[PDB]
Amino acid sequence: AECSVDIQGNDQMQFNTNAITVDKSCKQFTVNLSHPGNLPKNVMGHNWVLSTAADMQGVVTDGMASGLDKDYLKPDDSRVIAHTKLIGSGEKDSVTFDVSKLKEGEQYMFFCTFPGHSALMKGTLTLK
Ligand SMILES: [Cu+2]
């Protein structure tokens, strides 16, 4: 019944959530990302990126290949459903997207595209 979720990305290269369930009653969903850490954006930058579980690997690979000058996300990557900007220590960013971009029974994954972060910074998302 809640169409938003507060998520944190810290200096331990960890998100504080492993799973997110988007309620069908929601026409839109909001992700409020914050960085409670103290490490510089260049060494511990975090973002919240959503894609199907199948597309995660490709998005992550082409993301790091795009460098910091692109918030580690390939421009016009159709595989990306939604994303927050790349934030550093003490910062916050929110993104709201149309839930109609998701379908029941499909596996989605949220993750950080900063090089190497997705090893720990990834979780599941489903429409239910
Ligand atoms: Cu990160």
Curated annotation (Swiss-Prot):
Domain Plastocyanin-like: 1-128
Disulfide bonds: C3-C26
Sequence positions that bind Cu cation: H46, C112, H117, M121
SUPFAM superfamilies referenced in this protein's UniProt entry, alphabetically: Cupredoxins
Molecular-function GO terms, alphabetical: copper ion binding; electron transfer activity; identical protein binding; transition metal ion binding; zinc ion binding
Localization (cell): Periplasm
Keywords associated with the record: Copper, Disulfide bond, Electron transport, Metal-binding, Periplasm, Signal, Transport
Single GO cellular component term: periplasmic space
UniProt superkingdom: Bacteria
Pfam families from the UniProt entry: Copper-bind
InterPro entries in the cross-refs: Azurin, BlueCu_1, BlueCu_1_BS, Cu-binding_ET, Cupredoxin
Gene3D superfamilies recorded: Cupredoxins - blue copper proteins
Function: Transfers electrons from cytochrome c551 to cytochrome oxidase.
Protein name in UniProt: Azurin
